[PDB]
Design a protein around this ligand. Sequence first.
Ligand code: HG
Ligand code: HG
Ligand code: HG
Ligand code: HG
Ligand code: HG
Ligand code: HG
Ligand code: HG
Ligand code: HG
Ligand code: HG
Length: 1973
Amino acid sequence: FSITELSLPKGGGAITGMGEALTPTGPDGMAALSLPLPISAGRGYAPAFTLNYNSGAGNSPFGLGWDCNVMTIRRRTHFGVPHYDETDTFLGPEGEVLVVADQPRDESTLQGINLGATFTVTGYRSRLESHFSRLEYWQPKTTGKTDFWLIYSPDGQVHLLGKSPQARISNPSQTTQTAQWLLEASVSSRGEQIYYQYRAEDDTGCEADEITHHLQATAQRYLHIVYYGNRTASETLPGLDGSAPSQADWLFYLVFDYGERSNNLKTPPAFSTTGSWLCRQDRFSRYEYGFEIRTRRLCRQVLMYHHLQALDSKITEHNGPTLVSRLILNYDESAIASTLVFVRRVGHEQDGNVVTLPPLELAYQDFSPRHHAHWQPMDVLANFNAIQRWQLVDLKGEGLPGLLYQDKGAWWYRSAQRLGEIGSDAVTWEKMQPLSVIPSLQSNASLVDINGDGQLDWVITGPGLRGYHSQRPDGSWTRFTPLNALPVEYTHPRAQLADLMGAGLSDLVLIGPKSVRLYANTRDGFAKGKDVVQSGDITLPVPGADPRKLVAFSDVLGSGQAHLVEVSATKVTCWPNLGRGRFGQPITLPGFSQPATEFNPAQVYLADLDGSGPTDLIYVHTNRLDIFLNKSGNGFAEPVTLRFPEGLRFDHTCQLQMADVQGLGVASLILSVPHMSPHHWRCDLTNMKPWLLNEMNNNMGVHHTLRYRSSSQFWLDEKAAALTTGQTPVCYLPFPIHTLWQTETEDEISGNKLVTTLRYARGAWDGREREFRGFGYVEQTDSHQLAQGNAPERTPPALTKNWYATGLPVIDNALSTEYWRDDQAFAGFSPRFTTWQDNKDVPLTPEDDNSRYWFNRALKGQLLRSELYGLDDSTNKHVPYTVTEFRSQVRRLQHTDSRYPVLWSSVVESRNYHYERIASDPQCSQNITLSSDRFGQPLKQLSVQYPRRQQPAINLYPDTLPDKLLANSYDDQQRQLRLTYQQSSWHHLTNNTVRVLGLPDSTRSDIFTYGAENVPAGGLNLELLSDKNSLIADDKPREYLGQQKTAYTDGQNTTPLQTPTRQALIAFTETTVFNQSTLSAFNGSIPSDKLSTTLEQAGYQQTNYLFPRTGEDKVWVAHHGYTDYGTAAQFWRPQKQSNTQLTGKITLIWDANYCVVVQTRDAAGLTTSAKYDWRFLTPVQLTDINDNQHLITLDALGRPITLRFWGTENGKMTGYSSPEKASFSPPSDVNAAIELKKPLPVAQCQVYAPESWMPPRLPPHSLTLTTDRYDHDPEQQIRQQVVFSDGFGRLLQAAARHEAGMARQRNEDGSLIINVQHTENRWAVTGRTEYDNKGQPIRTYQPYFLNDWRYVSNDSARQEKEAYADTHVYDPIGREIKVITAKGWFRRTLFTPWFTVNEDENDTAAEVDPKLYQKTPTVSVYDNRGLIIRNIDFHRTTANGDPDTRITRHQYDIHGHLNQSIDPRLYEAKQTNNTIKPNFLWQYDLTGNPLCTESIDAGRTVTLNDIEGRPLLTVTATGVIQTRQYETSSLPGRLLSVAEQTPEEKTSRITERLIWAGNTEAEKDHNLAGQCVRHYDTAGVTRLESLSLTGTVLSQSSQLLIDTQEANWTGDNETVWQNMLADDIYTTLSTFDATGALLTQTDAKGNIQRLAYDVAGQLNGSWLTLKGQTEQVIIKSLTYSAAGQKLREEHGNDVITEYSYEPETQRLIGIKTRRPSDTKVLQDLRYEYDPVGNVISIRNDAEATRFWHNQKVMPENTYTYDSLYQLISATGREMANIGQQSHQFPSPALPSDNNTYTNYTRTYTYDRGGNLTKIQHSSPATQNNYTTNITVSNRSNRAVLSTLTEDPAQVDALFDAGGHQNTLISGQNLNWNTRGELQQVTLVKRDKGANDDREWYRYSGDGRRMLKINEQQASNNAQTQRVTYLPNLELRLTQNSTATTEDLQVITVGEAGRAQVRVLHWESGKPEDIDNN
Ligand SMILES: [Hg+2]
Ligand SMILES: [Hg+2]
Ligand SMILES: [Hg+2]
Ligand SMILES: [Hg+2]
Ligand SMILES: [Hg+2]
Ligand SMILES: [Hg+2]
Ligand SMILES: [Hg+2]
Ligand SMILES: [Hg+2]
Ligand SMILES: [Hg+2]
């Protein structure tokens, strides 16, 4: 919940690109990318699309790999073509099998619409639930209508799929056969709609060939236009009645263009077009639904249009809807495959110009057979003597072919195996093994089973088998063919296949990995010389019947079926496989040909060579071969002819095999020669898989390279690794899988690289469902490769080991064997199987193999275990930083269907260990879902924080730790077992026409806290915690944390609903703040019998406990976050909002279309208005509460480019000129804009240059120009800033234009030049940072001056030592563990699980007397909740002293709140007295707001806040009751008054009153609307009269109370208050520049100060005009360092001050003040610091002033510290007669006194609690030796000068209850006011009736001193000195009973302590010798 606030967006900053992202690799191993599309959110409900790349995906309307899909329901095609009857299975939008969920019912209407038929409606649900959406299949029972689907989403959306023909994919020959129902319409619960309009495939733009060969090419559908932002709210699906969309009814249109519209950069594509979409070169067909679906189109542009005329009637649209955004998709077009290579975002301006982002480029692995072909002998087969009668086939499905051969007279197989070392790709074949089958007893053809040992997967043919009847042996021998190279229905032929196979096949001969040549047995058609058979309407060839034609199965179409193919001398012909034995009409694939006398089918091979994967045709000649590449199934490319190795000739005695020996998914060439040696040769045409995305470049300096590796190779690696161990690997992946192996990111700006490397094992293939389950092991290594020049210390590679469930028990059960071993870790997790019964999980052991199969399958994909390591040189390198593990539960929801149950898989337990590489001492936490409801919402959850382990016997911590640190890291807070128990309830709205799940109802938290002995071995788990003996059983005591309830409204009724409506409108939220026990904090502060009423008035209410337990009565809650909602017709938009019942509503006024808020009216009637740019729906013009205007403009990409503001000040129009009075177009080039000069009528302008890294080359950058005065001010300056970003959008540096001066240089090649020179083009460069590819700032640079705004190269910065860099080192967690400063000192941080060790620059100094600080780190010690329970320091005053361990302890209660803190000193005292109180005790409400504080230093403070979080009642340490009143409940709730009452007072006093302005014309004229304009306070009244356009104070005034009047603003009559005031009105008036910086300030006496600024906005001049006088200069000139620090200051007295900085740190080391007139250095302070920055010496190099007789040299001051940086000693000079220090002030030495100065040494002593207890002053030469003692309380830090007491037990009585000292020194009482401010010091107490000498004080309401009065009452003389403190002015008035003897005004110019100048002006009583002013 939040209050709507209108504001304008800001310009400039970091440059972003298109937001494309690499998607983290899962156990699927694929490369994936996502690319956002420019889609307007519109009103909120909008279609959602992203363009996605997956390396495993085929062709699509976006080319290979890329796709962008719409939600669909479809028939399953995985196991074969559907039958288009009730035996079919359906898939949901996520690909999950749908299962019938309830009984079919009759329905005639939907959403009030008459459907024109009776429908049978069947509910379905996903087989594996995730979201619990509900699906319905609507099928007509009566005539004239068609089926459709609905989806009821769990968030209340309803979706309509495939109702109208435009949104269906159907068989064009049989329109009843529907394959896919596409999303057609959606509607949300709040009345928003979306309609999806598709375009059907057609013949437009195609050639005659394409049109002729593909009949009924109208099946395919392409999303075309999405209509959204309905103009009229409706709860009905749009188009449900069957009507087509009307564009007038909508505000937004998303359009996918397929080539119809113009595609240049000088005209916007028009919404309406007569254009023809393009016909792509790679047209392709798919057949898995049983009929041809032809794709001819590619999406070229994604276009966003707005109905501007409807969004803003001031805009007229003659041109149709207006283009607001545009994405261009450019392809590398090819007849083989098109690929997306170029993606660009473009915006069009009204003047015809365009503005663009840099394009995203993508490149793909090419296939170049000519370049890569070279034959290698296969030496590995040197002893393998088979030539012709062997096969290279993958028998077992290992993903690489093995050697299958007979050696008389037995059969043998040799599996592939790794050759040489793991990680290489070289292959050999292992020792021969016998085949489990015997070929000779198998019948010809017929399935067989071989070793080892897949179910029926191969077919065997051969002359010796029974059934063999061929006429052409030999060559015929026993051969093997994989079953999956044959049609699905090979085992049960019918139709065309059956006619083709006639009386069976004789021989099946592989001519490719998946291509089979066929020969028929002698025929049964009783025609044996017939070479064709008629099969219905097609004529099939009889295979083998014509010996001059090749007949084969092969996928020449790349669609995933085994098609029929005939190759003859003249043509290639394909009959496509339509499923169910059916084959389609013949398609010719030209142009392969060969002379008829030469053609020989024996020389033809069919194999996918490029991985497209239509199969390519290889024709073998005797000395060469012709490669005919397959053009997307449409024919063959011109032949590429490659030579055989010299000088071999291929003939009928040889063998050539096309086989995938690389596991690349492409065929290589394997040649066996009978005479030659060696006998076997191979040629690979490629080593990488073609067509995979391998390069990206965003053209902003980020380059990605992707490398892949076949999973077959990971298989070989795993198998070889398993050799050394004893295990035996499970094969997987018959089908080859190409895994993403490496991702290399290159930052072209920094030159830094990052290489992420993946390694896979335990791949799992499920033979039953025929799916790849994933890899059970994924290992990722991140290695930085930093550019040359960077520091040696770097992040070392991080290794993450991950194990994932595959759902195959044989794998999963063995995973935990590889887990990092810890003998004290808790027991590992096992999956939990349950069945859902009577609304609960009942655990079960799965009944049979089937049930076991499905329950296990549901586990797949879940991360089981993750370990993170750092691969450095540490002794702990093998111990993880962290370990996580997870437990899955699978719940059976239904199993009526005999095929499969419905299951819901989820994570029920997780465990997280933090070891930080200390094996013996981790933290561990665990989350458990105890129970959840039927839709998976948690009902009971538990979080467990485990206690630290008992101290181990063997110390694994580093021996560099300070002595005893480890022992002192133990604390009782580490030793509690903590169980946070959360209960939750939910509303679910469900019936046939409604579904909204998981609306929160209520939650409650409690916590159980137990001693460590309650932790079982080994660990808690769901079962132990659900048992009746449980630590969390209902009868166990627990502590209440709180509760919350969400209240719902129907939108009209004020009474909350019992059950929400579908709109789920939240009326308010109810949160508990107090229970009985927390209220104990107010005992003795608020009377018991007045408590309820008080809490009630504060806004709290009583309610019952939720999930109430025995004995629980009431809690106190706050209701907050109220909304009043509009009607259904207003889309239920919020019309009013308020935080609580205590404050008023804000009114929200929407545009006519309810898209945006155009006006807010707050509870005091103050109005803010916004005009919008309707191209982007962003505010561009704001009218504020004072009617001032703020205006920005946007470019065509929606980026702010100008800002202006104007309006009245003091009733007169001022500010920048409107665009009407002064036009301004901002420049397009940074250089032109930098040349611009005054006047500019804008406050700001931006120029964007995101393309600057594209060619002279700069990182992406933006320029901001800012004026500092309004355009009619002739003194307007133009500030200039350029900000550079890298390719990841991270800030590299900022450059600001400075005044001319000395700077370093950038030369033309971008190199930094250290030598300084004068320049007129000077810039200060700040924030200069080098990052690594993770965004870690690894180098930071000191600010510097440069003679250019342009970027200095990174390499140049790394080279120059004088660039002053700090280097930062990070661990694999991203934590910084070391910083080496530019000076070479360093900081270091050690992270361990229970404590963090910080070492600073002094601590580590000795490694780089510094021995003093050695081993004195600061340590933070943690409990098991991440809370800091100890701070440990090490105290030492001498290098050889033994360190004192100083432990400060913090205790957090079971609510997690800071309960106590105690310092080392009091803890030590408490060791022999446990009643001693800690420094602080705190009590809180249930939400953690402090209610009470008991401080031994400051006493007890108690506070009650109201439900708005505002202080209502406070009781101070001294018993004062302070109460605050605020505005009533229809106002914003601002402070109106402050009242206080002392325990002695009977009635309260009103000490403050605030009066707030409304918004009358006079108040807007002064910009006062809503402001506090009169504040009566403790000293008088302040009045605000005038504010500037920038919110600065133009005029304000003060009046003080008269001296005899105390603040008490009683009554409602302001006149009596005014009557309490002194007459003097002190008015301060100012003027400011357009940036709000002060220009002039006139004080209460009319003296004017004037300031002036340089071009960077730094003060560079200062003047004063005393009243009645002429202006005089105060600061003549002032220059700055690049870090903005004072450099050279020249005052009006001509004196010059020069500040010197240490270049590496910016530390101030010199302050030199000199007088030019006589060239005299007056003061020259030189500072020296230790490495951390303590001042260790100060020298004054000037000679002594003339006040000191015969002395010239001033001694160096030396300072020494203890290890806690307390000042231990100091030396310096003091005047010789100074005497012993007191509160008194010395008389000044005068020139004629001839005084001298001497040396002193002070030594300081501190206790163990920070108290300074002794000052020893040694000044030997002058006998000025003494000791100041301070006595510290034994129970607190109150401490006093020993003259007040020497007894620690008597110190506290010298203070009031709030710790304010009551006596300054003896004889001098201190009085404090009721706000704890010093009210009076009595300087001399006198016996009655005489008068005291005293000084007293008055303060403003915010604690600023306004008045000081000093009364001397000596006779004589009685003197009163009065000091009034005003802005820049002191009035110092001295009076006596008879006269005024001095009237002094002190003018102050500048800041006190920063070279402030004071001017003394007397009105009377000026001393004679001093000139006035
Ligand atoms: Hg799409
Ligand atoms: Hg040969
Ligand atoms: Hg041959
Ligand atoms: Hg070759
Ligand atoms: Hg296998
Ligand atoms: Hg543990
Ligand atoms: Hg208290
Ligand atoms: Hg500008
Ligand atoms: Hg005020």
